[PDB]
Amino acid sequence: GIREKIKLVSSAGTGHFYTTTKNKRTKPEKLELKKFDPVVRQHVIYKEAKIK
Template structure:
């Protein structure tokens, strides 16, 4: 059976609201992902940082 080429990661809000997005990322991409996305609890765009799903 073939191995998966993408992994599922969690993007957690840096504003400490507890909100997160789940996305897939290429396994070969080693860099830690950080994206500015909308936080509905604050109603603002904030920085989201990558965290592994347990």
């Protein structure tokens, strides 16, 4: 296994985040997706970040 797990952090500043994986050889650009944020009870854009 060489694919590495990443976290998608909401832009709303609630601090909620999702986690997923992404291929590092391809798709260098950051991942942007519209996902539901339980804190604000709305679907917002989640931005890629680093798991630490």
